[PDB]
Amino acid sequence: SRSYPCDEKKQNDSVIAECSNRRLQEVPQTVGKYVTELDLSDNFITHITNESFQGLQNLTKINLNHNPNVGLNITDGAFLNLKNLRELLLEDNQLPQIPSGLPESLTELSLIQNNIYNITKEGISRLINLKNLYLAWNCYFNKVCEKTNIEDGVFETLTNLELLSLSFNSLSHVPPKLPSSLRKLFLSNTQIKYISEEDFKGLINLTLLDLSGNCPRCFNAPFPCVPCDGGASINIDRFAFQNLTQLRYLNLSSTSLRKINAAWFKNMPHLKVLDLEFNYLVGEIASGAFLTMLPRLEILDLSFNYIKGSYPQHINISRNFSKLLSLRALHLRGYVFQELREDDFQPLMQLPNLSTINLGINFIKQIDFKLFQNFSNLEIIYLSENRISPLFEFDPHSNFYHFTRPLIKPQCAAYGKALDLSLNSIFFIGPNQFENLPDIACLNLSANSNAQVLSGTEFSAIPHVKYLDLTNNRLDFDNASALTELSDLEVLDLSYNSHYFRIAGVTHHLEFIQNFTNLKVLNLSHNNIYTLTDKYNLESKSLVELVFSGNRLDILWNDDDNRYISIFKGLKNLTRLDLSLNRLKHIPNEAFLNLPASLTELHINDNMLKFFNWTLLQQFPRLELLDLRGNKLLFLTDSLSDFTSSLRTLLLSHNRISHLPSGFLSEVSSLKHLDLSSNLLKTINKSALETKTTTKLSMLELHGNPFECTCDIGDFRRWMDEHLNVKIPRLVDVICASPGDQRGKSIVSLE
Amino acid sequence: SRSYPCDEKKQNDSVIAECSNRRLQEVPQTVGKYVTELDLSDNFITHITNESFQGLQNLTKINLNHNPNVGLNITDGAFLNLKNLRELLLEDNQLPQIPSGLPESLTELSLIQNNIYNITKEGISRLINLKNLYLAWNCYFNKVCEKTNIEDGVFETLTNLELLSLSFNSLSHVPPKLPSSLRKLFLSNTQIKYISEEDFKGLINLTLLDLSGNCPRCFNAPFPCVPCDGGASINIDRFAFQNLTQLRYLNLSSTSLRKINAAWFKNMPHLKVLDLEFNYLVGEIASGAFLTMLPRLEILDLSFNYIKGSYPQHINISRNFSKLLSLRALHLRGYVFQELREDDFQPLMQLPNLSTINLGINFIKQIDFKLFQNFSNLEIIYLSENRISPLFEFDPHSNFYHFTRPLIKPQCAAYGKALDLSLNSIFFIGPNQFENLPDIACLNLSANSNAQVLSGTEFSAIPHVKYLDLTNNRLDFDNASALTELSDLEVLDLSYNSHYFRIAGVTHHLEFIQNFTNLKVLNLSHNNIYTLTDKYNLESKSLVELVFSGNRLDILWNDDDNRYISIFKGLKNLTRLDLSLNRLKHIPNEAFLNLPASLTELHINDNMLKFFNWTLLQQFPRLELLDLRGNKLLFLTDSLSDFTSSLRTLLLSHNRISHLPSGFLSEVSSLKHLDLSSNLLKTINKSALETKTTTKLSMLELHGNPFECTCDIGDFRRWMDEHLNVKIPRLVDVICASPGDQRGKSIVSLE
């Protein structure tokens, strides 16, 4: 009754087996008969037939992707016996052709990343229930492939299709006879030079059109890239877009566009996001008669339109930018200019809804920051990666021309207005630096190569910063009053400042941490801190989370030094502590007891520990999570239930533990989750996990243990069938060691 | 006849067994009877008796250090049976007392890092042949320990002792009745406040005296440090040093010295190295009547004498520095001043033999570099770690107050005069920066946070640099003429410049490498290079070694891109190639053949490789070393001898290989060294390593393989005894896997 090899979960009242990554040479027949969704993805299966999926009714979905992993042979009508399948995922299977005789029940089919160069009536036209069809990434780049032949009006018979992606195939022409029902159509990187009037003419329901990468701009492309003759523009008919009144999204990126016809937008009152990236638009950004046509546009991406070899003094913004009323975010990146002036952004200053200006990668030497205060709604000022001074490698399921991640880390932005100066040249903060800025909750100073001693006078122009990123500088903390002018400070990231800390002869002062009443999260990671000056303790009444990882506690806690024994005790509010990567061989008993007793979460993981005193857990009544992972530990206590009543989760994975003590799990009612994976365990005696009282443990991880496959594991196997509420994951990965006959075989298979 | 557990080598015609780190619970009786030196260090041995070392004549030396590893019990006169022992190393054994009844044959004894607080006539006085005696590091710091009692005139009876180290013990007084034969005597950190006239009075042969750490300067000490009352100076008698005419070395460091008596040096015409570190000497460096007493002093270390809280404009050097004629290196570090002026170093400019000035850690903002040209002999200018702008944790066997490593990397210094600007603020190189400098062969620019585009005009003031360290900056290579003004350039280190390289939208230009006729070693490591602009190939006719490690060849060599296929082919002189850490799953065949055919050494190690085409080795007739270590490789060819005649060394360690092919080792006469360690091998068939022709293989590493201990390994065990010229190391670490009975046991032990 324990599901194998498939792990089974419950989602939306429904039933889904996860068989992915299971090294399956063939499709299991042991699948739960109730299963709605079957994921075979990333396996070794080389064959599909009519016997494979039998006995299975409610399956609406099959993921066959990535088989076999590092030549999938499918029989005609192998999938026909199943009338309930909507979604079918065949991606990355090295398929020569579309599989013949697919069920007509298919709403959604994914052929992405295959060898199919021929789209035929036989493979498609008989599926009338097709909603979304993905053919993308079959013929592209320098791959050896045939130009894609698309049989006349093959999609003509699909009256229900709202999504079609042919992107990254060799087409050269938009296929004739496209169904009216089309909503989203992806034509990107199809090598199409010409868009006629009659191509999209009959689609009135299109909400999205992707023409990107046709007549590409190939200079400095990090992919094989072939431009149109002379590197000319795509030729788009004056009337090509006239009958799309419903279009929300238009991706024109990398089309080599020098000038844009404003009459393309005549019929599109609803245009929302316009992607103009990777063209030559500097002239159009200077004048831009096409802007007056976009009153509803929310997002506009003009990024990377730079003229080759040019490094102008100022950016030139058309006054017509005042005509985009609903604009929210504006991306200008790789425009490459020297100096941003107050009067250059004038057209943007009256835009009511524009919260985001992306200026990244412009090589800007200087800005007057009083212009950002003359805007209305700005929540995000993204200046990252500039010169500002003081005073398959491509995911077919992702956007090709930019990253889809947030500009600012959501944790930071949630506090308020955001200013990202990261990856710049400001190595020193002058008294006047931040003057005339808005009220800044979130400030990113990361990677500014800042060597200064912070005296507490630096941020006084913007005292209300909640979240401060100082990461990856070389910071000299010689002053006890540092950063104290920020009274409302909550999150502080000091990570990767190790420059001065690692020099012993200089002075280091951390005392500033006590002065913060609201301080909550503090990152002190990877600072290589082995020594401090006159003050050996970190003390805060507010602080909650402290990440001390990547420092030397092996030195601080050295047996011959009593000075740092209390180092964390002064943090009385602290529920979370990260001691990882400190090279700890052991923790002196006196130093462990001096840990804050408020801790609910403690990570000592990824150290060298050969010893752990479990009796010391008596002093931590609030501790729900203990992370011991990635150590040398040989030793487990049998008395643990006498040591802690509070422990929900215990992670022991990747240790040297060879033996489970008799009465280990007994009488501890708290422990839900136990990670024993990747240990030295040969067997489990009957008396290890037996608990006379009530056992709340719902998860046990045994994978990676050298199990003796003899009759001695009968006690444990029996224990497994006796409790089915304990989930052991990766049951194909719990693998018998000895005897040599049973080596490689799962423990769940035995006489 | 295969030595076990001890590995045996030959040094100085002699015979030494290495038993270290062998997890020995007891002292082996299997030791080769001829053995001169026996190293038991870092083992589990808990006992020593009279039966341990029997049958062994010529042993002159025994290393018992670090036993047991993580309570050594020695019987009275356990070592007496051996009349040939000179050296005895007992270090770090947690010894309560000196072992009683030690042989009188001992010239050298090391008790370092033990619990011995009592030095008695019974343990020592009967050994008259003692030459060097190390008692150091028994009672120190915050360790729980007893003040050291030294029985009256216990060393009085040792007439042959030239070396005594009591350092880091609690003494408070220099022991009375010291033998005349003393040459080197280490009293450091013994808590001695007073040096009387009669302490050292009777030692005329002393070449070395270490008084360091008595009355320590404890501000900002990274160890528990207790000063004398008021933090006063050590009190040294006017006449204390009068009878040492032979003293070469004097370590006074960390004695809290405000002023120095010049009459201490009255009788020392031979003084060579004087260590003054960690005192308050700023006044003495300003006047210093003691300098006129040191005509022969070669090294003078004044480092870390800074006045607390002081940041003066200029350093003040006494005119009396002109009076040290034989001075070679001068260390002034942590003097902490702002500005170095031409006229401040005037007293030093006429010193004929002074090649080295160590200015590190002074927080210097500016220097006029034309003063270094007014010296005579300077080979080393060490400016590292300053503010200059544009335009147990302690090793008992090491120096406690500084690092003993070279200032400049020897490879760099060997080229000529050296200038180390590393760890500074110069973020831009102006045209006039290096003007008025000497002729610089070796230049360290590391860690200057330099973002500039090097145009080839930058170094023209010092064109003759052979070795250039640009490591750990953020370098923008946008120019093809970069660095080309250096015609004689040999070694170039570009490591850790990854800042701009990882941005795809910008341009990257490596073309400058071809312009160098003498370029030999090039470090391009950890630059995260996945993309380049207009030039996809590295080309040099001279270049020999290229380290490409820490980049992305997984991206560059992606199957869908032909652009970078030839990337290294243009280097026609290259004998050494490092492809490590490139995340390579596989190398496309066309890309491997495009590797330089001149390669004698190739490292692909520490990648993800699941595949290697051995047939491609046919194209590398010069290749003596192939490094495949740290990969996923499952597959070994049986045909290798047909593939390469040139391969001396093959490193396969840490791979997934489960099987040795029949006829693997056969007919390849070239292979000396084979590393199979840490693989999946269960057994070795008789036909794997059998070679009908002449076999030159002298080294085979099998440790870490899950060996079946059944009778099936008889074929291999037999093969081992049949060839004794093949050295298998770590024979305690070649460990039987199955059956469970033999698990943990070395394969060399079987029925």
Ligand SMILES: *[C@@H]1O[C@H](CO)[C@@H](O[C@@H]2O[C@H](CO)[C@@H](O[C@@H]3O[C@H](CO[C@H]4O[C@H](CO)[C@@H](O)[C@H](O)[C@@H]4O)[C@@H](O)[C@H](O[C@H]4O[C@H](CO)[C@@H](O)[C@H](O)[C@@H]4O)[C@@H]3O)[C@H](O)[C@H]2NC(C)=O)[C@H](O)[C@H]1NC(C)=O
């Ligand atoms: C030209 O410009 C257009 C318009 O911006 C771009 O069109 C977008 O293309 C991307 C890439 O395909 C789309 O992003 C993906 O959307 C998939 C569909 O999600 C929809 O439905 C789900 C629920 O069913 C909703 O949650 C979601 O909001 C959408 O409504 C997602 O399945 C994808 O995510 C999956 O893959 C990614 C990457 O592996 C993972 O991160 C996810 O966890 C998940 O597994 C992905 O989000 C996007 O939907 C398109 N926009 C529109 C409006 O349709 C073109 O890409 C662009 N041209 C190019 C090539 O640059």
Ligand SMILES: *[C@@H]1O[C@H](CO)[C@@H](O[C@@H]2O[C@H](CO)[C@@H](O[C@@H]3O[C@H](CO[C@H]4O[C@H](CO)[C@@H](O)[C@H](O)[C@@H]4O)[C@@H](O)[C@H](O[C@H]4O[C@H](CO)[C@@H](O)[C@H](O)[C@@H]4O)[C@@H]3O)[C@H](O)[C@H]2NC(C)=O)[C@H](O)[C@H]1NC(C)=O
């Ligand atoms: C220096 O140190 C600080 C302090 O730790 C780090 O900042 C924290 O970083 C961790 C990431 O490592 C962040 O934790 C992550 O938070 C996400 C929270 O997302 C929000 O929105 C979701 C809904 O989408 C809500 O559910 C949630 O409540 C939040 O409001 C979580 O999504 C993440 O959890 C997921 O991953 C974790 C394991 O990582 C699993 O346990 C979860 O089940 C789930 O799979 C994770 O919690 C944390 O938010 C950061 N906090 C702060 C203050 O920023 C810095 O990143 C670190 N910097 C450096 C340089 O290392």
Ligand SMILES: *[C@@H]1O[C@H](CO)[C@@H](O[C@@H]2O[C@H](CO)[C@@H](O[C@@H]3O[C@H](CO[C@H]4O[C@H](CO)[C@@H](O)[C@H](O)[C@@H]4O)[C@@H](O)[C@H](O[C@H]4O[C@H](CO)[C@@H](O)[C@H](O)[C@@H]4O)[C@@H]3O)[C@H](O)[C@H]2NC(C)=O)[C@H](O)[C@H]1NC(C)=O
């Ligand atoms: C005050 O100042 C004095 C004078 O400078 C310092 O005295 C030096 O102390 C150090 C530390 O003990 C000595 O360094 C060590 O010397 C040992 C002896 O080497 C001699 O003999 C060998 C061959 O037998 C020669 O090769 C060598 O040149 C010497 O003639 C070495 O054995 C040590 O090296 C071993 O340990 C180190 C560290 O583990 C390893 O790096 C080595 O590989 C090796 O295993 C070490 O080199 C030094 O000899 C002393 N100088 C003199 C002139 O005797 C004091 O240390 C200083 N006071 C303090 C505490 O700061």
Ligand SMILES: *[C@@H]1O[C@H](CO)[C@@H](O[C@@H]2O[C@H](CO)[C@@H](O[C@@H]3O[C@H](CO[C@H]4O[C@H](CO)[C@@H](O)[C@H](O)[C@@H]4O)[C@@H](O)[C@H](O[C@H]4O[C@H](CO)[C@@H](O)[C@H](O)[C@@H]4O)[C@@H]3O)[C@H](O)[C@H]2NC(C)=O)[C@H](O)[C@H]1NC(C)=O
């Ligand atoms: C960027 O890349 C460059 C190029 O590789 C690196 O520079 C090389 O660094 C390696 C060290 O990793 C250096 O190689 C080492 O050289 C030592 C040579 O010492 C000299 O003197 C000895 C006598 O004392 C002579 O025998 C010798 O001929 C030399 O004249 C060797 O001692 C080292 O070998 C020892 O270690 C190696 C393994 O490391 C063993 O194989 C040996 O048997 C022995 O145990 C080693 O050879 C090399 O010298 C450097 N060359 C240059 C040009 O500097 C940079 O370090 C790297 N930088 C960064 C930032 O990573």
Ligand SMILES: *[C@@H]1O[C@H](CO)[C@@H](O[C@@H]2O[C@H](CO)[C@@H](O[C@@H]3O[C@H](CO)[C@@H](O)[C@H](O)[C@@H]3O)[C@H](O)[C@H]2NC(C)=O)[C@H](O)[C@H]1NC(C)=O
């Ligand atoms: C301040 O600015 C710096 C630099 O721009 C920001 O660092 C960047 O943060 C992003 C988001 O976390 C990182 O990208 C992510 O990396 C992880 C790990 O590989 C990956 O899982 C994610 O999918 C995403 O790719 C990025 O690594 C990092 N960049 C650098 C230079 O390290 C930082 O986030 C900013 N801080 C705040 C609070 O905004």
Ligand SMILES: *[C@@H]1O[C@H](CO)[C@@H](O[C@@H]2O[C@H](CO)[C@@H](O[C@@H]3O[C@H](CO)[C@@H](O)[C@H](O)[C@@H]3O)[C@H](O)[C@H]2NC(C)=O)[C@H](O)[C@H]1NC(C)=O
């Ligand atoms: C240029 O200046 C930099 C910075 O001072 C030098 O880097 C430093 O080099 C030394 C010598 O190699 C490194 O010390 C060594 O580290 C290794 C690895 O841990 C260790 O095995 C050695 O015993 C020694 O401790 C040191 O790591 C490194 N410092 C930094 C900041 O990384 C560099 O050597 C200089 N280049 C030249 C050519 O002089």
Ligand SMILES: CCOCc1nc2c(N)nc3ccccc3c2n1CC(C)(C)O
């Ligand atoms: C030789 C170093 O010992 C102390 C020290 N530590 C620092 C430090 N972390 N930062 C500094 C910044 C500017 C000037 C001096 C210092 C300094 N200093 C120098 C001094 C001004 C005496 O504190």
Ligand SMILES: CCOCc1nc2c(N)nc3ccccc3c2n1CC(C)(C)O
């Ligand atoms: C948007 C980036 O695309 C090209 C580029 N790459 C670089 C570069 N690696 N470095 C630069 C330094 C100063 C000014 C401009 C650039 C630059 N630029 C800008 C430009 C002047 C057009 O080359």
Ligand SMILES: *[C@@H]1O[C@H](CO)[C@@H](O)[C@H](O)[C@H]1NC(C)=O
């Ligand atoms: C601005 O956005 C708000 C929603 O936050 C919306 O109510 C308002 O109508 C928008 N104004 C314009 C000009 O689009």
Ligand SMILES: *[C@@H]1O[C@H](CO)[C@@H](O)[C@H](O)[C@H]1NC(C)=O
């Ligand atoms: C910190 O710096 C401020 C301003 O430079 C100064 O007033 C104060 O003395 C410093 N605090 C110290 C040294 O503890």
Ligand SMILES: *[C@@H]1O[C@H](CO)[C@@H](O)[C@H](O)[C@H]1NC(C)=O
């Ligand atoms: C301790 O943390 C809690 C939870 O964040 C917070 O409410 C409280 O203010 C903190 N205590 C102090 C003294 O700030």
Ligand SMILES: *[C@@H]1O[C@H](CO)[C@@H](O)[C@H](O)[C@H]1NC(C)=O
């Ligand atoms: C564990 O900690 C306790 C303190 O409660 C101490 O008595 C005991 O010695 C420690 N155990 C070990 C093995 O150090």
Ligand SMILES: *[C@@H]1O[C@H](CO)[C@@H](O)[C@H](O)[C@H]1NC(C)=O
């Ligand atoms: C300087 O050093 C050389 C050896 O290189 C030596 O011959 C000469 O006598 C020394 N001069 C002085 C003043 O010590």
Ligand SMILES: *[C@@H]1O[C@H](CO)[C@@H](O)[C@H](O)[C@H]1NC(C)=O
């Ligand atoms: C490199 O820089 C020099 C000086 O700035 C300039 O003369 C030359 O044009 C540049 N070379 C290029 C861009 O290839």
Ligand SMILES: *[C@@H]1O[C@H](CO)[C@@H](O)[C@H](O)[C@H]1NC(C)=O
């Ligand atoms: C190739 O390397 C050798 C050995 O260092 C050197 O002698 C020769 O000059 C190099 N060849 C060229 C063309 O510089």
Ligand SMILES: *[C@@H]1O[C@H](CO)[C@@H](O)[C@H](O)[C@H]1NC(C)=O
């Ligand atoms: C190995 O390389 C040779 C070229 O000599 C090629 O013919 C063969 O296909 C390659 N082997 C594999 C398994 O790719």
